[PDB]
Amino acid sequence: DRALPHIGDGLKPVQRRIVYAMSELGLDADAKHKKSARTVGDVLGKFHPHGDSACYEAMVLMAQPFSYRYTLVDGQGNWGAPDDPKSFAAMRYTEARLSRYAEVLLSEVGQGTVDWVPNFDGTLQEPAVLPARLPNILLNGTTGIAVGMATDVPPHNLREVASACVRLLDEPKATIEQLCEHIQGPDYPTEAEIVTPRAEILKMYESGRGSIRMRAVYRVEDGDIVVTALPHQVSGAKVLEQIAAQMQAKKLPMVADLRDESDHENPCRIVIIPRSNRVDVDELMQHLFATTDLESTYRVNVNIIGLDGRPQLKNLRTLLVEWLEFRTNTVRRRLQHRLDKVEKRLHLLDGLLTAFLNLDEVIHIIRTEEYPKQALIERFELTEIQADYILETRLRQLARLEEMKIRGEQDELLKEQAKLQALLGSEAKLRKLVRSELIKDAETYGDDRRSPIVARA
């Protein structure tokens, strides 16, 4: 009974339901925050009918910027703090709406891009996989208490991953090293350094399995060592217990005192005070990195669910080539979906035009005929769909009808129709559209690398 993330949008059922539930409640990034309970209530009633705690815990995690590399929920109130991600207030107090980044997963939902599946009682439908515009699987990875999970995917930089996709679109046979010219490695939500060598980072992407080793970043100010950023999910308080324990065992005669000076706005500020300005700082820290959580490791095992529905230990190339296949399939359905709405709209205008051109008579037929609909159909050779649309027309909407506005919209649609057939008519034109959107989206939603990679940056 373990959940594995889907390559498509990088989500597990728990997560997918919370976000879908929220976009259905209209809680997008432009909406006003609504009490968390409202969202939990919907998820509980419509999608996962077990409990308020299971759901809300996964939801709080999405709103924590130190848990998710790209948050999916924008939260107001107490949504926990860095050293204890469990100190979140009850759901009756916190308020939530979706993230701006959430748009990456949801903007294309109503455009025939999703495979709908019945919910738990068959009364509503839910998305099987969200139409992600960027590979959230690598961007956010597997977030939360990682010791329980078998599958581990670290987070990545959105812009680096997007550039690697561009590369595959241009050079379909680009090897993994070539993809690593753009993707430096993982990118965690912390200024801490990844010290794994480039050669090992490369093998991890070739294999799908490996290890990442991060290291806290420090500076010196007034002779005191100040750690400004810790490895991912490392408790600053736990680090102090560890150093303090060594002080008790007479292993740190060079350490005088420790102080946790992190405040509201400054999340990490652990001060290690040396016995004197004659203490070798770099020698001390090397020891602390080897003996405390100031240097911690992370597992990698990209065993995820693919488009064929079965799991696979996927290396970076295998994963991105497959994600691009998912993305192009998605964009193809988005265009097909639109083309259908354009063609239904052209059919209505073709009917509406005829009605406008014979409007005097149309209004006469409507006011003086036992069967008005069936009379217009026989007279002006209209389909039933055209006839209904004419009869649904209100008198205020009848006032605004102008022959040129009808032919003007009819022109726009005929050319938008030509554009869509050209895009669906060749793989080459899709590819450029996908490439074009990967680049805009990267500009819109992307950010600078946070965790530096010592082996490169």
Added chain:
Amino acid sequence: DRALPHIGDGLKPVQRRIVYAMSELGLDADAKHKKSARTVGDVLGKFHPHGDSACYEAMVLMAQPFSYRYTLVDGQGNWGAPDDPKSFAAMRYTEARLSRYAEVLLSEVGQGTVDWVPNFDGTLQEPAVLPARLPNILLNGTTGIAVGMATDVPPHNLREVASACVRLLDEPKATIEQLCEHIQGPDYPTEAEIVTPRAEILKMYESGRGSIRMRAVYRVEDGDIVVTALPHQVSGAKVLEQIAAQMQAKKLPMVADLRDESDHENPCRIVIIPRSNRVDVDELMQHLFATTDLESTYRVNVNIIGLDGRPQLKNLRTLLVEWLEFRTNTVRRRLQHRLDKVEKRLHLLDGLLTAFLNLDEVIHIIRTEEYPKQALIERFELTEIQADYILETRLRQLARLEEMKIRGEQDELLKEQAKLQALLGSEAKLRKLVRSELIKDAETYGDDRRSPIVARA
């Protein structure tokens, strides 16, 4: 932090929210059952944002016919059994819709009868008190684990209570004894007998405080004593433990064996097997009634919340006179509400008629005027409301307009308007309407007395 029932509809906030939530989800008695979770989810998200357990427990209680004298929820699945009302399945399995009786509390909700109050976060509104058509306060009383509660009101027969209301409407000064010519006493959901004397039942209604003593009903078949109905909320299994314990203490040499033969359809069937057909049955049972739960007592303390918002220990007369005041106020607003919709409708027809009588010109003005709305207003002396309604008219709706249908509906409404002004114009005409509805409603939703009162029936 204790909840007291409101005289108006006899509900506490917990209860009121669950039913309102359910009628808002469209789960009335004509709708299809929907998974209990859906309802719990709404209550949790919109009205009481604490938990799935608190809400669902109160909800299960409403669906149990052996807990509520008049159930408010019709449930499918395992909604617990008589000897253990806690053996209900999880909310992801059970299904629920409202009761037929629920109509008594909800049919008048959308008719300006309720005082709306903001919900917990000020985003929606909830009813302060439901517009009950019958005094649910006495009909259902205070249901659930009564040891925790300070306020206790036993259930009553709907038809008996309705007749007492009629009596107060006819004889406003009718004394409590006179009200007791109709209300025999409490009426629990069990065939068991109430053995409290009539004189004490009378003092309890005069006081608002007292005690009810019920007794299990039995018959003899093939020499074995068969208890067919137990006092309210008495566990058949607990009774057997009690008798068995006496057998261990050598107090029942006349008792040979005990058997719980209750099945799916037969809720109570406890067989006490005497040592021989020579055992005095009535002498044995008298002893068991005095020494076991086969005869149990119930407290009464009608300390409820009145229309003035403050609590009061209310005797039967005080309570019913006040409930009738609530009922007439409710019906008065229901009529006022309707009268307003009739008058708005007459205003639209007055405008629609003029438009039909000058339709050739109206359609011309609509097709050839820079400002159509503002032109009709100046031409035919129409209010803005009338003008909008004309312009909203669809072409299919324009085909069905016939001068006689407009004047025909205009006649009906002018006479319905006259009826409503006559009812609101005197207390005497309201009273008869209230009386008339109390009687129909009693016929529709009422049933025979279940718990016989030995002192009378």
